[PDB]
Nucleic acid binder design. Structure first.
Lengths: 115, 115
DNA sequence: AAGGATCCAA
DNA sequence: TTGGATCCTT
DNA sequence: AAGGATCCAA
DNA sequence: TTGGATCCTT
């Protein structure tokens, strides 16, 4: 929908610069939140593991529940994310934040493909 | 609903006779189908394993998918069921036929408690 | 010799 | 944390 | 001395 | 067959 903007970013030199997964991941998060803060926020609440919390508004909440997790700082928004995850999980946290955001499954597979 | 009939069976001297789980389970399936053949039937279609079929209209359909399974014969109706299953599963197949059939969760835990 | 837990594969 | 089915006996 | 497979618990 | 977090290095 507004996911033509996501496309821009997949193609962007900046997205391309990034050499690490972690890094593409935060850029996705950051941009998504910059589209709909709202839809992102909702998207987030439903996202978490068995025992670990994934997003949260501050470093600490994440350090508590689930222990070695790598609370990365702030995307470019007001959230904090877990980083101690292989790319698979990295992917699905995006699959999820994107499904709840109503992005076409076509995009989604692409996006996850680049991470 | 018509689950007071179920309640009579849990109490019945007949249900009480059976000493093995299998037998109680067959008596359940058997009784349930007697209530609503139609609702039993729809209940059934959704019930199956990763790779075994659980219910079927004949012994062979079962023997084929999945391998030692113990096609038991017939309840007292027209179906055939898998038997090579521990009590647990024997349970959840009842839990399933039963939720789909709209019995109150209260009953259901009871029932599955007596298997 | 049937039944079913207990163990192993997704 | 579900499901298959060996394989050890309630 | 971060990143993220792997490898191990539900 | 998913989620943790070790623990070996793209």
């Amino acid at each position: 929908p507004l996911g033509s903007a996501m496309r821009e970013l997949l193609l962007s030199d900046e997205y391309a610069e990034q050499k690490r997964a972690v890094n593409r991941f935060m850029l996705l998060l950051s941009t998504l939140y910059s589209l709909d803060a709202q839809a992102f926020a909702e998207a987030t609440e439903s996202l978490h593991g068995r025992t670990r919390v994934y997003f949260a508004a501050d470093e600490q909440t994440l350090l508590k529940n689930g222990n070695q997790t790598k609370p990365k700082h702030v995307p470019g928004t007001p959230y904090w994310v877990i980083t101690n995850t292989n790319t698979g999980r990295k992917c699905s946290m995006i699959e999820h934040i994107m499904q709840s955001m109503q992005f076409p499954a076509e995009l989604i597979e692409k996006v996850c493909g680049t991470i």
